Amino acid sequence: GVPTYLLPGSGQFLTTDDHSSAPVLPCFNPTPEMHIPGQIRNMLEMIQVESMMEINNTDGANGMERLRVDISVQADLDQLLFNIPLDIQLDGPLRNTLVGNISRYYTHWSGSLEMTFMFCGSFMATGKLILCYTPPGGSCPTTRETAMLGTHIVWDFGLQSSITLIIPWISGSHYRMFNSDAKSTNANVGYVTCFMQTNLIVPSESSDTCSLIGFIAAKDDFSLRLMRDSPDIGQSNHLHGAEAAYQ
Amino acid sequence: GVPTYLLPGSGQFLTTDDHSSAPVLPCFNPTPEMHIPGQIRNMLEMIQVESMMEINNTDGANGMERLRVDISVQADLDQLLFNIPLDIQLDGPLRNTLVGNISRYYTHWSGSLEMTFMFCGSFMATGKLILCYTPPGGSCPTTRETAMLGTHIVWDFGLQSSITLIIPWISGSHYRMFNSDAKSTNANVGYVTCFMQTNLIVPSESSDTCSLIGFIAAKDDFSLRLMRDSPDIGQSNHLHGAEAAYQ
Amino acid sequence: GTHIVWDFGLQSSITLIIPWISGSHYRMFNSDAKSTNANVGYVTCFMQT
Amino acid sequence: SDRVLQLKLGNSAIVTQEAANYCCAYGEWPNYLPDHEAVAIDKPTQPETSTDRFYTLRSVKWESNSTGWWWKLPDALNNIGMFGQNVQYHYLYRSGFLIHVQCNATKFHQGALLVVAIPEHQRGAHDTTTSPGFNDIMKGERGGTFNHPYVLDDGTSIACATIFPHQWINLRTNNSATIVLPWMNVAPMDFPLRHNQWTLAVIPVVPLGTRTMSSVVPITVSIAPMCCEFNGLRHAI
Amino acid sequence: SDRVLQLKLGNSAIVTQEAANYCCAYGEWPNYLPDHEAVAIDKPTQPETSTDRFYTLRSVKWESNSTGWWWKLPDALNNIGMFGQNVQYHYLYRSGFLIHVQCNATKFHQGALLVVAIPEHQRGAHDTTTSPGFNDIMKGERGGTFNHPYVLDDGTSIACATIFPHQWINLRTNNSATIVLPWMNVAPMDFPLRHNQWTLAVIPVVPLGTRTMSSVVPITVSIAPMCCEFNGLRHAI
Amino acid sequence: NFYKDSYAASASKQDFSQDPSKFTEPVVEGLKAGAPVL
Amino acid sequence: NFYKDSYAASASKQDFSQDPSKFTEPVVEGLKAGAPVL
Amino acid sequence: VESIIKTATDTVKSEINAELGVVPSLNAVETGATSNTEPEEAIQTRTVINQHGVSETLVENFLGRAALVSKKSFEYKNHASTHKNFFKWTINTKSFVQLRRKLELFTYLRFDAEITILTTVAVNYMGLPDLTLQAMFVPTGALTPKEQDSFHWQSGSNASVFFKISDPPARMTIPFMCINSAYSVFYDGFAGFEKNGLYGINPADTIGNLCVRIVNEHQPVGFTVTVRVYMKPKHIKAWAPRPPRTMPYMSIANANYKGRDTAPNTLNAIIGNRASVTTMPHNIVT
Amino acid sequence: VESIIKTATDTVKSEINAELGVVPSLNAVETGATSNTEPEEAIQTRTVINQHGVSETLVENFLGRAALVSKKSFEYKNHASTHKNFFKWTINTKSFVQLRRKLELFTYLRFDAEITILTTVAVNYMGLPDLTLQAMFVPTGALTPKEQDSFHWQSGSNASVFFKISDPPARMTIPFMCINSAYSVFYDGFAGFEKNGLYGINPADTIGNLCVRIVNEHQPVGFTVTVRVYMKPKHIKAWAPRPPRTMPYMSIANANYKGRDTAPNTLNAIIGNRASVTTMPHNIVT
Ligand SMILES: CC(=O)N[C@@H]1[C@@H](O)[C@H](O[C@@H]2O[C@H](CO[C@]3(C(=O)O)C[C@H](O)[C@@H](NC(C)=O)[C@H]([C@H](O)[C@H](O)CO)O3)[C@H](O)[C@H](O)[C@H]2O)[C@@H](CO)O[C@H]1O
Ligand SMILES: CC(=O)N[C@@H]1[C@@H](O)[C@H](O[C@@H]2O[C@H](CO[C@]3(C(=O)O)C[C@H](O)[C@@H](NC(C)=O)[C@H]([C@H](O)[C@H](O)CO)O3)[C@H](O)[C@H](O)[C@H]2O)[C@@H](CO)O[C@H]1O
């Protein structure tokens, strides 16, 4: 026979191993394949679709009210309207999104993100907003004069209803990672803030409080690494009916 | 199937074995390589850099005072200034050097060593010294007339501040080894002694006591064999914080 | 500002170049030392060591 | 240019002067079942114009506190016109769908409706371990309403529902949404009375609002089956 | 020939008539970040002359009982000139450094200074398990001093410190040391306010001594950033 | 794969084909860069 | 290596390239044998 | 539109833009298309040759992991006077939430399933017996054994695997066996021709029954035996991604939801609350 | 300058030298360069064809050894009334001094890590149980199990390895997983944007968490189980060698030092003392 010797690791069951194994049903002929719409081959395809950010995650905001940010006609100038924490790996407005959910099945990420906002006021309503992305380093800006110094887009409401703020990949390291410390130098992405560039202006018969819906998605320069179990689901007991599967 | 049989050694875990093993994270894409200054590929590259010998390893000499040898204007002739034990595998002036530290991770060695001394007196100070390497066999020479019979270099202080004494590889066997017996025929390298060739001479305003800094390094004809744990580090208890890694 | 660190030695002299740095092609005299078309700036000397 | 559109199928046609391009689910287009994917061997009937035409369902009223509406396919049309007759007389059916949702208002009105076509939208019941019943699912032409649109009545989320074929009707922008749906199933054909391939969901993410004269603002759904095929002829169920 | 040298960058220049050749750390030379190693995608700013020039720090006095001095980079320059401004306004920075240490005395003076550039010089604290604090590490332009130069304040040894890029200033031989440092890091760029790539250490291995007129003998450090690049523009921190 | 049934083989991690547009841009008329969408 | 990921392979003990001079002689101007260094 | 992607896309340097009629940052969410604004059009970019791989997110790898799908403990003893030295498990992938949520990120899935069976024992001390177990695959609603020693275990046609506790976990692959071209992860329909059937349960998607018994007759003392079954899908094809599950699961038979008592993941609020829309959580306080 | 070296350099015979202007034995340490004086220039040499190999000092071999990085003993029993049949270990290479000192001879290191897990047991006598253990890799600061039987062990995505005490030690390779091009053995910085962070600890250099549990339920008696983890780096690239550690280590979190009470390796004196600089230790007394 062939002389052999067993190596360390012999007999172990590694859940991520990759080997062939005995076919239970020999000569079984699987059902022929049929074309089906919507085939996905890489999860990166899924996170490139923009989904709604839960920006209004505040007490008093229930259900869908949390998915839209209301802006009103201001009495003062250069007003701060809202900000958005940026760690797609932590709980916040970005967590329950396509990019956020899938990214949380991983530990490392790299790539540009894109935030698109759709103005949902009436046609007669006008306005200009400024959306700013502030790379990490300091405290979140609270004035337009400060936020304006970062990456930004000035948005003019009009026929094209939506604006896109690109959050370019700006990092020292190739990848950023999750480690449960939001202030870590390898985790913090910076901030996104929104101020009135001019003001929301509407006539008497238009609602004077309008909503914006913010969406986010990854661009195709995105990459995810190091699979891990998602923190977004868990169980303490058997699900109802689980034990009945044994009866 | 294939007929086989297990050989002695089967199932063992040899810390120096060399085999492939199951990848924990399948399809993982490591961060791209980037050029980084100072890559080292063979430890022999490191021991070729000269480092400071602790020649003044005496009671009363503290910290950096141990890294320099002071010489003074002599009243007598042919004065012995200092000597240096040569086993780079035992505790002494050569142990805490680049060549000494790395060599002590091994058991066998072969090759020429080089000792370079830099005179650090004032510019107005002059002098001639003789550095001698005495191959093994007898007692360390205590007079210049005796040391002078071995390998040596007569050093004249001047613009070029440093002199090099080559300790050529002179051994009966291909390699020398450590076995904790400094007087073993396969370990003892011989001796290095330094005498005044003339004298240190300085004017009234120059310090009349000057320091030399001795360095040592291996040449590129060096070779190290038989890896072993270094005797230069050890622990009796858990390090502080080690157990906290489990909490 | 523009400078040169001078080390005393065999070559006994050092040269500090005061390059022509002006907004206008020429500077002029008009008896007002603080005029924008007259003031050249300053030269200072400190111990380096 | 991409704001005006005319859809014509059979003896029916629809135009909109305030569209937003239109969606082809997963970039596909309806087609008849090819021989290399067929299973049922009887010659199918392909009614064409009598079934592949627009069927307009009863409208619903968009109110300030509405939670949303849904219509399951083919259930919503299983009792309408010749499409309904073919469905009742045949054990098997297959088809795509051209969906057109309509809602106009005023330049002083605001509101945003998510119009999404969900494949296999298996509903969940709220706060109970008992699975939804037949009457909770099969609403027919009337359709149903969302109890908790925030989680799409299935424990997931409307926030990520954009992963499905969709459009929006944002009043200041457009007054209609159009989605073309190809046959979507793991089998080449199916029994129309017990399984719904798609669910059309219309949900007001941004509520209807205005300060001008208050008027009833309806939402209307018109659906045209496409490339209908039926097999397994027998009596009407 | 290898004893005289002139360094010129931007609007600054330095000459020495008593040099000892000069060191290029690991035989490398500074350079701008190539496209095939870049990570941050925004167009970087390359200030050139406004930042790539010599900055002279406050001098220190070499005394008979001195233990040594150190300056961390870029910390030491993070608040000096336009280099400091770019650092404060940008999240990311990258650069090499040209270091020139100066110390002259008399032909009757003796002393030897080890001038070494240590990559990632992570300091250790003495006789305690508590890690060094922010203020123990970030000294800025003033730099710090060694507590136990014998072990490089990190439990290792100055004896083997020659494994790092270095030169010596041996009073009877030369009056200056010059070391060129390339970008040294595991990432192409970094956040300048929380990480120091290099630490310049000047340690008197052989103490200052003489029997002539006693005078204050200073040690001066001049540092010129090289090939500076900054990314991630925002407000000043 | 030493087994006679192909379905017994090890994993197939070599399909790098992608078409995000079926999810990101399922619009009948392609949208040109820079040009107004509507 | 029978594993699909290259990082799972056995050790690579075949890189005999060296350049001691980056540590031993990092001087800008090369030093010639026998000639006075300064 | 389709193409081969092995690394994240590169970035091209871009210049200043001031062109009338060209507004790349403006989009129309109403069309249903995701914004196509490129980084190069939003800001001035540099050139970047991106070498980041995209293989760890391949569907085959994302779902290609052996996940726990069944865990059953029973008493191995003389049951003279409950699982009497054997049990029957109707296979399903809805009992353990980690695997379930991932599979439910898709509408349809086609894959072969590698099954691994791990067994552990504990005395109810004189040592642990190296028992032999038998795992028999019994098709949908098919005839299962009713006793540890019934004739049914003769397994004339059913596939059975006999393994020892001292051996590595047993393993075998069940082929993609659906009567359709793919399994329905979700099923908006009723499995029967009558109206009283179960909703959302397509029988075609139930791999089958797993009957496991200890072959050895009982010992003089009792033991607790636990059998864990793991499943790893391979040769995977997936269609129509879906919104991820947010509310805790309630049952293996449906998508019923209730939500946590308090955010996060409460029916009323999925994301945890912050003081206001201008309050920055984890703000850097330098 | 770069070249392929497979053996120590040969020696060439040399003659008498008496040349003006040529002084090979003189050097200038101030330049920072190491002496370039060759043996042939210092003395008269003979020709020697040196065949001594240099492969045992290759970095791959120098660091290529499985070294102990973790040792944990815990009680396996009914913990009704401490590591309750499982433990969690934040991976680090700073706890055992032999491996630590060697890794710290370098500034940066890039390598894949072969992990080997050895398990031993002792009764607190009726024999030793052949238990099954589970080692689950849980990423940085990620969610770890809190009970021997929590749902977290279902390991839907995390990699888990199940092994028996009777099997050879478990083994697997963790790839070079740093977010950077190499691990930072030393880090002169703070891991956070605020000023209160930990100094010298770059999170990017922490491979992760290792959660190990005994899968079997407790037995009627208690046992002491010890798990030892070994790590062997391979496919190694190293940069910027450093001064070796001399003072005993004090903590795994920093380079703090104190020194031995008396030489050798005391803060005041690394090398042991000799009577004087003219005293030859171990002098041959013939
Ligand atoms: C662990 C840590 O570093 N900090 C803790 C704070 O984060 C925590 O405050 C709460 O944190 C919550 C985090 O959100 C998730 C998460 O872990 O990412 C969201 C998950 O979807 C959710 N999973 C499930 C199945 O519901 C998960 C889970 O609820 C928790 O792990 C259970 O505790 O939470 C969230 O933002 C909360 O709104 C926030 O208050 C504080 C609480 O005292 O403790 C810190 O140690
Ligand atoms: C064992 C033998 O053959 N002779 C013993 C003498 O050597 C010993 O005298 C002392 O020897 C010491 C040796 O230096 C080291 C070494 O082992 O090489 C230097 C190491 O770096 C050090 N390691 C650590 C972690 O500190 C190591 C260690 O301290 C000792 O092994 C612990 O005892 O010592 C050194 O030269 C001393 O200065 C010298 O006095 C005598 C002492 O009675 O015993 C002999 O058996």
UniProtKB/Swiss-Prot annotation, chains F, G:
Modifications the protein undergoes after translation, according to the UniProt entry: Myristoylation is required during RNA encapsidation and formation of the mature virus particle.
Subcellular location field: Virion
Coiled-coil ranges per UniProt: none
Assembly mode: Interacts with capsid protein VP1 and capsid protein VP3.
Role played: Lies on the inner surface of the capsid shell. After binding to the host receptor, the capsid undergoes conformational changes. Capsid protein VP4 is released, Capsid protein VP1 N-terminus is externalized, and together, they shape a pore in the host membrane through which the viral genome is translocated into the host cell cytoplasm.
The protein's name: Capsid protein VP4
High-level lineage: Viruses, Riboviria, Orthornavirae, Pisuviricota, Pisoniviricetes
From Swiss-Prot, chains H, I:
Description of how the protein assembles with itself and partners: Interacts with capsid protein VP0, and capsid protein VP3 to form heterotrimeric protomers. Five protomers subsequently associate to form pentamers which serve as building blocks for the capsid. Interacts with capsid protein VP2, capsid protein VP3 and capsid protein VP4 following cleavage of capsid protein VP0.
Membrane-traversing stretches: none
Binding site for N-acetylneuraminate: 260, 264-265
Name of the protein this chain belongs to: Capsid protein VP1
Subcellular location as annotated: Virion; Host cytoplasm
Function: Forms an icosahedral capsid of pseudo T=3 symmetry with capsid proteins VP2 and VP3. The capsid is 300 Angstroms in diameter, composed of 60 copies of each capsid protein and enclosing the viral positive strand RNA genome. Capsid protein VP1 mainly forms the vertices of the capsid. Capsid protein VP1, together with VP3, interacts with host cell sialic acids to provide virion attachment to target host cells. This attachment induces virion internalization. After binding to its receptor, the capsid undergoes conformational changes.
